[PDB]
Amino acid sequence: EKGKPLMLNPRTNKGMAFTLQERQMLGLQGLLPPKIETQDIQALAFHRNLKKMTSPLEKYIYIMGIQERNEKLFYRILQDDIESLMPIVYTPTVGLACSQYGHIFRRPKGLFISISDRGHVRSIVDNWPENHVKAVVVTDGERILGLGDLGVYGMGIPVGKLCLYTACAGIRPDRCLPVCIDVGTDNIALLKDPFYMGLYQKRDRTQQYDDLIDEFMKAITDRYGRNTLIQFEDFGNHNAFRFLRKYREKYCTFNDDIQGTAAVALAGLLAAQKVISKPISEHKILFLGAGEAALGIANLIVMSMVENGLSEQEAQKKIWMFDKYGLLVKGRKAKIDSYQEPFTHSAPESIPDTFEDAVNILKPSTIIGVAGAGRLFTPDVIRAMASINERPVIFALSNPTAQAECTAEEAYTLTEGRCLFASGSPFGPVKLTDGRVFTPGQGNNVYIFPGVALAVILCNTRHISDSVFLEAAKALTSQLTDEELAQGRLYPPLANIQEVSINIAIKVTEYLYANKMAFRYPEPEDKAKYVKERTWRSEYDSLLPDVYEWP
Amino acid sequence: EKGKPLMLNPRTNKGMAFTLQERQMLGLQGLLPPKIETQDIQALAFHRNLKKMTSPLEKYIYIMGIQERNEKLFYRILQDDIESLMPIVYTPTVGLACSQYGHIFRRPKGLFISISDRGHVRSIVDNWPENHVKAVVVTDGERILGLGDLGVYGMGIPVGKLCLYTACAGIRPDRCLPVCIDVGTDNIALLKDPFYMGLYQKRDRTQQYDDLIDEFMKAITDRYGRNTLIQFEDFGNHNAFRFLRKYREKYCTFNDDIQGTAAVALAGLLAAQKVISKPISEHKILFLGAGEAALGIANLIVMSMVENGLSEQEAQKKIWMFDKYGLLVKGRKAKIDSYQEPFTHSAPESIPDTFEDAVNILKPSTIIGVAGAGRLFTPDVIRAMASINERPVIFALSNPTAQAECTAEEAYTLTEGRCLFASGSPFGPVKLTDGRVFTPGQGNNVYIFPGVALAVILCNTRHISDSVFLEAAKALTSQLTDEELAQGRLYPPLANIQEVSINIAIKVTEYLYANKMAFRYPEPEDKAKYVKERTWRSEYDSLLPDVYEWP
Amino acid sequence: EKGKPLMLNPRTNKGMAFTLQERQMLGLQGLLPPKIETQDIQALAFHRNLKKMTSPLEKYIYIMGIQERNEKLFYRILQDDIESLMPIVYTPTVGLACSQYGHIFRRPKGLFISISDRGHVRSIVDNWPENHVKAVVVTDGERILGLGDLGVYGMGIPVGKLCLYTACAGIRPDRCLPVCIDVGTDNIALLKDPFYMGLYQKRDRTQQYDDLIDEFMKAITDRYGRNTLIQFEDFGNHNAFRFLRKYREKYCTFNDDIQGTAAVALAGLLAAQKVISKPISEHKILFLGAGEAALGIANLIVMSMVENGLSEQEAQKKIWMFDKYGLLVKGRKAKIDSYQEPFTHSAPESIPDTFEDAVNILKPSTIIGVAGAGRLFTPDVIRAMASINERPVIFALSNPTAQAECTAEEAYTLTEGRCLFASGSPFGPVKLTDGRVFTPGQGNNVYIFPGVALAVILCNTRHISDSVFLEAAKALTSQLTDEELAQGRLYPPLANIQEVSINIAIKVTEYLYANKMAFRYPEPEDKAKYVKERTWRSEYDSL
Ligand SMILES: NC(=O)c1ccc[n+]([C@@H]2O[C@H](COP(=O)([O-])OP(=O)(O)OC[C@H]3O[C@@H](n4cnc5c(N)ncnc54)[C@H](O)[C@@H]3O)[C@@H](O)[C@H]2O)c1
Ligand SMILES: NC(=O)c1ccc[n+]([C@@H]2O[C@H](COP(=O)([O-])OP(=O)(O)OC[C@H]3O[C@@H](n4cnc5c(N)ncnc54)[C@H](O)[C@@H]3O)[C@@H](O)[C@H]2O)c1
Ligand SMILES: NC(=O)c1ccc[n+]([C@@H]2O[C@H](COP(=O)([O-])OP(=O)(O)OC[C@H]3O[C@@H](n4cnc5c(N)ncnc54)[C@H](O)[C@@H]3O)[C@@H](O)[C@H]2O)c1
Ligand SMILES: NC(=O)c1ccc[n+]([C@@H]2O[C@H](COP(=O)([O-])OP(=O)(O)OC[C@H]3O[C@@H](n4cnc5c(N)ncnc54)[C@H](O)[C@@H]3O)[C@@H](O)[C@H]2O)c1
Ligand SMILES: NC(=O)c1ccc[n+]([C@@H]2O[C@H](COP(=O)([O-])OP(=O)(O)OC[C@H]3O[C@@H](n4cnc5c(N)ncnc54)[C@H](O)[C@@H]3O)[C@@H](O)[C@H]2O)c1
Ligand SMILES: NC(=O)c1ccc[n+]([C@@H]2O[C@H](COP(=O)([O-])OP(=O)(O)OC[C@H]3O[C@@H](n4cnc5c(N)ncnc54)[C@H](O)[C@@H]3O)[C@@H](O)[C@H]2O)c1
């Protein structure tokens, strides 16, 4: 293939970095301005122009424009400034862009499967040009974080995540497929817009919904394979959580809100155990929330303790849960699911009405907030922990900052700088009245999903075990330096996400092979060399024909 | 376009003549054996192998194999040995090949239009890949010369003629379209063959036949233009002749059996008038046959005489016709058509029962045989002419040698070497008993159709006048040298058909422009430079990209 | 994809078999004659046309023409008349045709790598249009069996072998790559020919030759993977056998003239054991030849003997070799390689200077001829075997019939119909004075190379063990029925090469999975269903 096609294909387009010889031999001479550049001077130009733009949304439109025209340059400028541009390409900017920029550009991207295509989903899947898709990320657009129901404009979230698959772990873009399932929208802003690109119906919540996602799983699997990695993104939590439980064993799938959160949470708790060398006997965990998030984090804490010598029944006894209906205790008016039973224990002396009460009676070393309510970690609960514990571990993991259980400021000030705090919410540094400044823990799922994804695909793995996320959590905290640990860092620097994501991937690769969860053989001797050599890189390949004299 | 496609396309394939640099830059390196040749050493190889083959049919299969793989090399070896290979590529070999080699190779070529496609002929025409067809040659396969009804195997004749369009006049092959109209076959050899490639029905001879050729003319014209040249080849004579009369004014069409024969005939008569300087007063022409062939030749003789000072009515009076029912005379039991009337005259003293009689009473300077009977120019008729005329002009133009009115041997021997003889049949040299050897006149339609075709296409001409064939006839004989004329040559050497065809084309180009029958403007000042520069040549073009250092 | 390109591509072109629906949908109406046919009608037409062709050369040209126009029709025709057309597409007529087809037609196929292209082999491999090549066959054209050095025209043999890969074992043609390495020709008629299509230089035997082969190995492996099966064919016996040792542990490689020849030989030897049931202790095998052919046959015989209770050194003691300088004995004046050492034994009291004298002293049960020196299984050698053994085994395997150690006639006549005779030559049936008719065994590498290839490709095997060829030999003899063994057959009928090839493939698939040399997972529970449902078939697909 030669001529204009090489320039209109972003996967081949080098733009001005097309060599004079390449331009002349491939029929590009005259179709490009008369100057040869390098990827270095290209990337510099787009950086200079990106830093004249102050709006995150303006940055999003400029960088996503480069993806559509030059793939290798898009992932070079992304990796050159990964900490700054990860929040542009993905969360939080991606949600704000979709809502606003979908109706202005109307540029189709990824594969759209409507409920109207029920019966023939394979025929729609077959229309996708790439024949070796390894990674599928799908949205229905119902629960976009901080916005809500964006319908088909949801497509941007799977696109933005797959960007970080490539940027962070070096997963090949051509092996990636962003999907948006359109079953309607409950947002009348879209239903009443004449220029809406989706289906004009309220969300189908009947058996036809469950049967369409069933058909989509079979369809993707039947074209690309049983080992094809599938992630549900910004789906309704009830749907997202019940689909993990339905497809986890049959298909190669994992969920960031449960399993990524568990791994990131455990990583922070393990990092806290390196500064606070508290013996596992002195450890008692209390959860605000007893749902799929709590169950997932609790499972990985139990499994961590069983590896460190404790018993499953002993580990569980060190974990307490407090839901809407108070503490989970054997013999309670409110219902306890079969999943919540292991962390449901014999009642203590006093039954706590509030969470502040529960803390004072149970005296936990750690409190974890996974109840999407609000500031339930009230100043009184934060002060009680500072009284009971020298260095209290306080994890407010409810992600929409509003729903977070406490702020970094109200955590560090009311614990006079002694608390080990982490959150999913982006709290800035917090300065005490003695003068010392505290930079809080920020658990991001970007630490886990790239590394796990690369390993599973590279190993041709068909099932993702709980232990993958345990091994991912240990791998993340293993990369924190003794200097960083002494500065109170609970998480590696996000600027090093590439080295971090690949080192997690090598350590999960080692686990999958050792526990017969890998189908790629022959098994490599050096799993580090295996992963690092199979990563996709942003360096332009030569498209120049090999011309030589016959000796 | 690069890679294997350049080699599988005969229009681009240079084979071993692909330059090392071309091979390396266009992705051919390794797909060809490791040797670079030239068109010169290529052509030499295929000539050496062709001259180890003695069978004309074996030669046909070998040379048609080169056409399908390398277009430019096919037309180079054809033009290098044009006199020898014209009878292989076209008549007489093409008819013998089609009949025998169609069922062994079953290789589709050209466009097939069946009577079953009535209503949708445009849709079939639209499926032909070339968008600028200038020349269409069509067969129904009914009257293949010396064989008969070959049905769809007829396709070979239009293919073979279009080869000579390119070889003789330099008409572009991509601008040429061979067509075969399948309305059935009356040959039970094909109708009973399970491996027959045509329609299993007797020839449709209803209104559906006439309406299909009508639809085909409109279809070709509606895609390619009103100026698109159309020739009917090896059609039934009744169909071929009535279709010339139906489409001659509406469409750009000419017929070789009438108009090519007339031009070739007149050319020989004009060549005879250069050796025999007989005044036009002493000229009297007698025809055996009064059909479309005779009418066409007679028309061009009249028009030649009117240009040389005689009157249409005087010229006609010098032409007599003798059909199945004897001499055409005013007041005769047998019918005289409105077309035959100008050459139907007041009866002489004696009414001739036989053609021998007619010769003795009329005492013609020239006799022309255009009656598809047999040896009607009997030894007695040939002897009578030798008695009446010093140098008798005897033209036996009935083409299947069997149907020819006399042989070269019986012409020259019974006229003791004084006759100026021509035929369409391939008679070898004839030696008299005094010792002198006579090489007879051989009127071939290849003298006319290439030159006429090139001129008409180059001039964007929509109507082919009788005068085109008059100008073609004068142009042919104008090329005979005074040395050749003294050796009794009535026709130029066939080895020089290229120079001959182009010189006719220049002279017809001049006529069409001067008589407002050309639509290509601006009109060229030098019609020689116009034609010779627009001819397609067998020389390989360079497909090498232009690589140069920037100064 | 649409219109003429579909018809000009042999992989897609169905010809007259293109359905009206397809012609209407793919813009073919008008480009094809009105007739619509079935592959059945097409096949019958080309079968009738080929029966009228007289020369095997003329037949080769006709069928190879169908291969370049309609690939599925070519493989239907070939599989319909496999026994008669295998000698046309491949040995023996492929070598004869290689000369003429090249000069006359000059039509290009396969991948050509020159010593001039050294350092740039990846460029050439990358120019091949197919991305999923699973089977590569390569020649330099030095030892074309029968004709010798045919230079760049030797390309015909790889093209011929890959046709049988597909015809016999249903290996997808688009995953098959024929390669010809041009390092020059020592053939003086070709060097003198102005229309020779190769390098006008003598065969480079310098380090540059060995380096080109290393670069070819790496290039193919770099693009298509380390799994990629590579087969060296009609190479110089020197290079061919030394390249097996070099690459067999690094790459997925096997040589037909050694490992294929060894497997077909053992299979016949195993077939003869089922008839006579000689106690394994009484077995004494004497080779005429101590080349890598004899070494390969011998290695597989000891492996069969070890599988049946014998120790390795006690199996080796039952195998003797006799070459140009006489019997291989410890301390002989003549040279003995390290590979010949296991079958070099302590001198008997009497040392034979003649092979007849070797037969008389050693008293062998089996004589295997692999020398290429002509009729050295002399009447007196054959008479001696008939005297010593009730049912003597005589294998004259030297391929060109004129360099065969004895004839079927000579074998059966001078043994009074008691011998079990196999050859690689096409000897006809032999009728004795007692009225009994003997059909000689004909060993053909086509029994082994298709089945072994499909199995290795399907199992994603990277190293082909000696045991693969022992299991292939066993699988071939298992095909032989009791009536066939009773009728004195040593090899299955070639008419059933497809069934034989797929049954062999299934047994090798089973071995590779059982011995952890198969890298395709998940592992199939039915290894027979796995193979049979992965076979490419001549039936047209709906376009
Ligand atoms: N690049 C191509 O166009 C292409 C396509 C198909 C096959 N091939 C070739 O076929 C052979 C077969 O491949 P293999 O099974 O040995 O691969 P592998 O064993 O190196 O990789 C194991 C699995 O991980 C996948 N993988 C590897 N690198 C990846 C990345 N950066 N992002 C996402 N997924 C990745 C592969 O598709 C495969 O399924 C290879 O040698 C290859 O060169 C090449
Ligand atoms: N905005 C969003 O997009 C969104 C939506 C859902 C969940 N989330 C996040 O994901 C996590 C998982 O939540 P979920 O989907 O399992 O919700 P859920 O309602 O299924 O479970 C949350 C748990 O919190 C408990 N809870 C609720 N209100 C409480 C109160 N006032 N006091 C004590 N306990 C209370 C519930 O009993 C329940 O056990 C949460 O941390 C939440 O921040 C975000
Ligand atoms: N070669 C191509 O791919 C191609 C195709 C279409 C147009 N063109 C360009 O567009 C311009 C328009 O052409 P034009 O009208 O001036 O042509 P023209 O005036 O040179 O020719 C007059 C007519 O004769 C035809 N003709 C010329 N040479 C011929 C040959 N060897 N065989 C058969 N027919 C022949 C032309 O198609 C045209 O209809 C040209 O300058 C040409 O370069 C090129
Ligand atoms: N074999 C073929 O493919 C074939 C077929 C038809 C014509 N041709 C040739 O084309 C030319 C045109 O013929 P046509 O199609 O006009 O045929 P036609 O029958 O239409 O006209 C031929 C003329 O010859 C006359 N004629 C026939 N027999 C005669 C006889 N015994 N004596 C005197 N006159 C006689 C007829 O009256 C008629 O005027 C002929 O010269 C013929 O050789 C060849
Ligand atoms: N089970 C079935 O019914 C069935 C039938 C045909 C194809 N398939 C295909 O098998 C695939 C499974 O993946 P896979 O390709 O890794 O496993 P596979 O078993 O199809 O492949 C085994 C290996 O052998 C090769 N191979 C397979 N068939 C071949 C043939 N006829 N000729 C030459 N080489 C051949 C393949 O390239 C691969 O390297 C599926 O995608 C499916 O399309 C399945
Ligand atoms: N069975 C089959 O289908 C098949 C297939 C391919 C090849 N082959 C045969 O395999 C053979 C391989 O051997 P090669 O010809 O390449 O020679 P080689 O050099 O490989 O070995 C031949 C051996 O025979 C010995 N020898 C030579 N002349 C002798 C004589 N007069 N007396 C005793 N010993 C003598 C040599 O010393 C040498 O050890 C070929 O002859 C070929 O015909 C058979």
How far away, in angstroms, is C131 Cα from ligand 1 center? 12
Distances (CA, A) of B398 to B145, B179, B368: 12, 26, 10
3-state SS class at C46: helix
Query: Which atom of ligand 2 lies nearest, measured to the CA of A403?
Result: 43
Residue A296: name the closest of A436, A149, A445, A489 by CA: A445
Strand order in the sheet with A229-232: A111-114, A176-182, A135-139, A229-232
How far away, in angstroms, is B354 Cα from ligand 6 center? 87
CB atoms within 10 A of CB B58: 13
**Phi/psi of residue B378, nearest 5 degrees:** -75, 155
Sign of CA dihedral B162, B163, B164, B167: positive
Nearest residue on chain C to B52, alpha-carbon basis: C104
Cβ(C106)–Cβ(B45) below 8 Å: yes
CB atoms B196 and C35 under 8 Å: yes
CB atoms C45 and B127 under 8 Å: no
Closest to A547 (Cβ–Cβ): which among B2, B21, B548? Answer: B21
CA distance C12 to C19: 13
Cβ(A462)–Cβ(A250) below 8 Å: no
Tokens of C31: 């480009």
Cβ(A90)–Cβ(A97) below 8 Å: no
Write out the DSSP string of B179-229: EEEES--S-HHHHT-TT--S-SSPPP-SHHHHHHHHHHHHHHHHHH-TT-E
Pairing of strands C420-423, C393-396: parallel
Residue A531 CA to its chain's centroid (Å)? 20
CA distance C307 to C270: 13
CB atoms B27 and A545 under 8 Å: yes
Ligand 3 lined by B297 (C-beta under 6 Å): no
- Kindly name the residue from A14, A59, A72, A90 that is annotated as catalytic: A90
Place of tokens 């579909």: C6
CA distance A339 to C365: 76
Gapped junctions in chain C, after residues (C–N > 2.5 Å): none
Residue C159: name the closest of C224, C84, C83, C78 by CA: C78
Q: B30 — contact with chain A (CB < 8 Å)?
A: no
Place of tokens 């689909």: A243
Strand order in the sheet with B111-114: B111-114, B176-182, B135-139, B229-232
Indicate which CATH number applies to the domain containing C132: 3.40.50.10380
**Phi/psi of residue B377, nearest 5 degrees:** -75, 80
Cβ(B324)–Cβ(B293) below 8 Å: no
Residue B409: name the closest of B457, B385, B377 by CA: B377
> What is the helix (H) or strand (E) element at residue A442, kind and residue range?
strand A441-442
3-state SS class at A40: helix
Quote the Cα angle for B467-B471-B473, to 5°: 110
Rg for chain B, CA atoms, rounded? 25
CA distance B296 to B304: 13
- What lies within 8 Å, CB to CB, of B458 at 6+ separation is B505, B509, B520, B530, B531, B534
CB-neighbour burial class of residue B396 (10 A; exposed 0-12, middle 13-18, buried 19+): buried
Which B positions 66-85 lie with beta carbon below 8 A of chain C?
69
Report which DSSP code applies to B401: G
Residue A454: name the closest of A532, A514, A523, A539 by CA: A532
Place of tokens 């008008």: C30
Cross-strand partners of A509: none
Q: Which amino acid does the sequence have at C178? A: P
Q: Is the peptide bond before A440 cis (omega within 30 degrees of 0)?
A: no
Distances (CA, A) of B139 to B110, B236, B259, B262, B372: 11, 10, 18, 22, 21
- Interface size B-C, in CB pairs within 8 Å, comes to 131
Chains within contact range of chain A (3+ C-beta pairs < 8 Å): B, C
3-state SS class at C366: strand
CA distance B108 to B131: 20
Q: Which amino acid does the sequence have at B24? A: Q
Quote the Cα angle for C476-C480-C484, to 5°: 150
Cβ(A295)–Cβ(A469) below 8 Å: no
Distance spanning both ends of chain C, measured CA to CA: 9
Distance spanning both ends of chain A, measured CA to CA: 29
Residue C381: name the closest of C403, C398, C397, C364 by CA: C364
Q: Helices A497-514 and A156-169 meet at what angle, rounded to 10?
A: 80
Residue A518: name the closest of C522, C526, B261, B257 by CA: C522
Quote the Cα angle for B184-B187-B191, to 5°: 65
Provide the annotated active-site residues of B: 90, 161
**Phi/psi of residue C472, nearest 5 degrees:** -65, -45
Query: Which atom of ligand 3 lies nearest, measured to the CA of B175?
Result: 33
CA distance C535 to C531: 7
Tokens of A441: 């823990």
Q: Which domain does A62 fall in, by range?
A: 4-258
Cβ(B60)–Cβ(B98) below 8 Å: no
Tokens of A167: 């940027």
CB atoms within 10 A of CB C359: 27
3-state SS class at B546: coil
Tokens of B321: 């016709």
**Phi/psi of residue A452, nearest 5 degrees:** -60, -50
Cβ(B152)–Cβ(B182) below 8 Å: yes
Write out the DSSP string of A65-79: HHHTT-HHHHHHHHH
Q: B185 — contact with chain C (CB < 8 Å)?
A: no
CB atoms A25 and B548 under 8 Å: no
- What lies within 8 Å, CB to CB, of C280 at 6+ separation is C305, C308, C309, C310
3-state SS class at A253: strand
Tokens of B474: 């004068």
Ligand 2 lined by A398 (C-beta under 6 Å): yes
Tokens of A239: 């749907």
Long-range pairs for C158-161 at CB < 8 Å and ≥24 separation?
A: C158/C110, C158/C233, C159/C109, C159/C110, C160/C89, C160/C90, C160/C91, C160/C94, C161/C90, C161/C137, C161/C231, C161/C233, C161/C449
Residue B20: name the closest of C201, C117, C106, C184 by CA: C117
CA distance C54 to C60: 11
Q: Count CA atoms closer than 13 A to A363's CA, side-chain side.
A: 6
Closest to A550 (Cβ–Cβ): which among C116, C460, C522? Answer: C116
Ligand 1 lined by A175 (C-beta under 6 Å): yes
Return the exposure string of A326-343: e unless at least 16 CB atoms fall within 10 Å of the residue's CB, then b. Answer: bbbbeeeeeebeeebebb
Q: B12 — contact with chain C (CB < 8 Å)?
A: no
- What lies within 8 Å, CB to CB, of B108 at 6+ separation is C7, C15, C31, C32, C33
How far away, in angstroms, is C46 Cα from ligand 1 center? 43
Cβ(B393)–Cβ(B276) below 8 Å: yes
3-state SS class at A394: strand
* CA-based nearest distance A522→chain C, Å: 6
Residue A436 CA to its chain's centroid (Å)? 32
CA distance B496 to A347: 116
Longest pairwise C-alpha distance within chain C: 85
CA distance B181 to B199: 11
